[PDB]
Design a protein around this ligand. Structure first.
Ligand SMILES: CC(C)(COP(=O)(O)OP(=O)(O)OC[C@H]1O[C@@H](n2cnc3c(N)ncnc32)[C@H](O)[C@@H]1OP(=O)(O)O)[C@@H](O)C(=O)NCCC(=O)NCCS
Ligand SMILES: [Cl-]
Ligand SMILES: [Mg+2]
Length: 280
């Protein structure tokens, strides 16, 4: 009917872990977000967390600005009672919605014009305390009997770890899609992971979810490895390229404009993990 573009699904990542902005670039970014979000970021103790959260905000603003054609300074983002970022009530889309996650060295965003969307990123890391088996026993309540049988079916304990983190990202993607936050009973959610082995450079779409013991055929999941050690899961509730495009700071700043005045307190106020021994 109209001479107009139609939004497709968006899959974007940003390497916040290797982002090293100058001071002017950091402070410009701080100016380009909402005041209450800026306040929230100014209270993180560590730089890597401030950087991750900043990246998430800028990705969400670039999304709305460029896919909904709303001036950056006119984007009004809100949060549900359970913390979930949402776009304030009226674009022309049936169910425009978006979700981010930030873990290890990356921020990731998924968005969709109609499908309800959730995302999680997890990095495989050896346990901070105790053996792998002790970790699995501490974490027992998060996964069902059948999910544990799959996780523990590999001979290699590290492969079991990968599989643990993959199943975690999958469940958290579902939970984030529906916005319930904390307290969802994880025993209710049973994923049947397929295929068993994932390589870099493909999106995989065969995993299925059973909720309260019945297959939820209206939900689909996309799984990929952004690198050898980071797993991403997108959950979607009812010509497609679904690989994540990795953006840089310049791309985050493409439609950005300052919204608050420059704030020098936001420079030189964070700790860095390089200053301490990583333990736990
Ligand atoms: C926020 C939550 C969903 C996950 O926290 P997390 O893993 O530390 O955070 P992630 O980086 O993956 O995602 C955080 C982002 O989600 C968004 N978010 C916040 N609340 C949300 C909610 N209730 N629903 C969906 N997204 C939400 C925010 O944009 C947040 O980024 P920000 O803090 O920079 O604003 C938290 O509610 C939670 O841990 N509950 C689920 C626990 C769970 O069941 N885990 C799976 C175990 S197998
Ligand atoms: Cl913001
Ligand atoms: Mg998470």
């Amino acid at each position: 009917l109209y001479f107009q573009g139609h939004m497709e699904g968006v899959r974007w990542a940003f390497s916040c872990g290797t982002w090293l902005p100058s001071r002017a670039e950091w402070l410009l970014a701080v100016r380009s977000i909402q005041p209450e979000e800026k306040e929230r970021i100014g209270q993180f103790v560590f730089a890597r967390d401030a950087k991750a959260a900043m990246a998430g905000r800028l990705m969400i603003r670039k999304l709305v600005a460029e896919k909904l054609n709303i001036p950056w300074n006119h984007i009004r983002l809100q949060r549900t009672a359970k913390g979930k970022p949402v776009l304030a009530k009226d674009n022309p889309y049936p169910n425009f919605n978006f979700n981010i996650s930030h873990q290890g060295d990356y921020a990731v965003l998924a968005a969709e014009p109609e499908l309800q969307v959730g995302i999680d990123i997890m990095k495989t890391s050896f346990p901070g305390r105790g053996s792998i088996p002790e970790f699995f026993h501490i974490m027992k309540r998060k996964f069902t009997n059948k999910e544990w049988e799959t996780i523990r079916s590999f001979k290699d304990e590290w492969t079991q770890l990968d599989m643990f983190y993959r199943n975690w990202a999958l469940k958290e993607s579902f939970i984030k899609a529906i916005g319930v936050g904390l307290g969802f009973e994880l025993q209710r959610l049973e994923f049947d992971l397929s295929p068993l082995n994932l390589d870099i450079g493909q999106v995989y779409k065969e995993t299925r979810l059973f909720l309260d013991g019945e297959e939820e055929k209206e939900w689909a999941f996309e799984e990929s490895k952004i690198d050898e050690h980071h797993f991403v899961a997108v959950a979607l509730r009812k010509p497609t390229q679904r690989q994540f495009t990795i953006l840089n700071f310049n791309d985050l700043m493409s439609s950005a404009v300052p919204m608050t005045p420059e704030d020098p307190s936001f420079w030189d106020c964070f700790c860095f993990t390089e200053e301490i021994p990583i333990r736990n």
